[PDB]
Amino acid sequence: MTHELISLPYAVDALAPVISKETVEFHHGKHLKTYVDNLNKLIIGTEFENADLNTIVQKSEGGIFNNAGQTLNHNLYFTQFRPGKGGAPKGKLGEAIDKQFGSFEKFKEEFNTAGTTLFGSGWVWLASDANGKLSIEKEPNAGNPVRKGLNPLLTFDVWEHAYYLTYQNRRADHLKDLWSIVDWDIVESRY
Amino acid sequence: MTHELISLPYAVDALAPVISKETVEFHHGKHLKTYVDNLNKLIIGTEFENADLNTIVQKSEGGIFNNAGQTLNHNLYFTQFRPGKGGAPKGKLGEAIDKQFGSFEKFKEEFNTAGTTLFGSGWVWLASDANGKLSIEKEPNAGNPVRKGLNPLLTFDVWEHAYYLTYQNRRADHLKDLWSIVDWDIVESRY
Ligand SMILES: [Mn+2]
Ligand SMILES: [Mn+2]
After folding, report:
1. Which residues are recorded as binding Mn(2+) (chains A, B)?
2. Crossing angle, helix B104-116 and helix B91-101, to 10 degrees?
3. Which residue of A76, B120, B129, B177 has the smallest Cβ count within 10 Å?
4. How many whole angstroms from A160 Cα to the centroid of ligand 1?
């Protein structure tokens, strides 16, 4: 199979200033393209030749896993954002967040803290199990909740390339701004 | 024990375009300052409290190690560069490199590759053991050779903050460009 560089569901400048047009150009256009290209090369001659991305992330290791995990993480990351959105979650997800974290505000506080305290490169993930129980997962480097059987709902990329051009070392400030571009309709759909 | 922010032996714009003025300001002025302040705040209460940098690094763990290792990594990193240096190593080191890697060009190729293939944040290190044996070590996140009892000679920081402002995703190009600002006279002295 040939894994693809996903086409974005919005214009490249649609998430500015939180994820600037320049950041989308390098993050999506260069980093993700590299992950996809490396993944396509590394799976040739392995048991993942004809596997779907999800299967490769659940089973692979080493370099293959690093590129697979990164491809999946970015695919979910870019597709969960939209301009003119943000706001608070609703429906079952909104109620699940309220019941399990107390309030949306408290949830954001814990999520931001998990993202800020993750040392080095990685991802902070909001994930659910088969019963709807939510958890905040800290995933170093290429980690993804799917490697644990969990459902990936919302992720903040804390690899420095996700925010350095606009925020430099201010990771916390970037995380606080990400909430403004989250499309909760999309996250809710994953739940 | 409570350390400080080392002084740069050159002007902040002296390494352009390899390490830009803004990068030095953020890398040295913000990132390293934070590692230093965090280290000072963490010595209190433990055993490594009162211990010189090298010892803290080889003896500490968790957050204390994370900040001591990064402080030591950066101190060695910033001081090994100089505008107008570069070139090739001489003396015992230059000979050790040819004998152990074949040639300086080959060593650089190996070094560059180790840096480019280190997944996530980290450091590529040229280290020496007690018998003078040289090795290229990939140190993820805050790793440093001093932790294995080795002599840290030369390091390229591959945390993205070290190059993103100028090179964005082009890590490989950044590593190729770093050779022009390495002060082999300083590296030799550590060997
Ligand atoms: Mn990313
Ligand atoms: Mn650094």
Report:
1. 27, 74, 157, 161
2. 70
3. B129
4. 8
Amino acid at site B86:
G
Of B55, B88, B104, B25, the residue nearest A168 (C-alpha) = B25
Among the listed residues B26, B18, B60, the one whose alpha carbon sits nearest the alpha carbon of residue B43: B60
Instruction: Tell me which chain A residue has its CA closest to the CA of residue B160.
Output: A160
Q: What is the DSSP letter of A120?
A: S
Rounded-to-integer distance, Cα B68 and Cα B59, Å: 10
Q: Are A126 and A134 in contact (CB under 8 A)?
A: yes
Closest residue in chain B to residue A122, using alpha carbons only: B120
Closest CA to A153 of A190, A181, A180: A190
Backbone angles phi, psi at B184, to 5 degrees: -60, -25
Task: Confirm whether residue B157 is marked as ligand binding.
Answer: yes
Name the DSSP class of A132. Answer: -
Technique behind the model: X-ray
CA A106, distance to chain mean position in Å, is 20
What's the gap in Å between the CA of B136 and the closest CA on chain A? Answer: 20
Apex B22 CA angle, B78 and B16, nearest 5? 65
Quote the tokens at residue B99.
């004998």
**Across the interface, do A161 and B169 touch by the CB < 8 Å criterion?**
yes
* Interface probe with A: pick from B38, B65, B121, most Cβ of A within 10 Å: B121
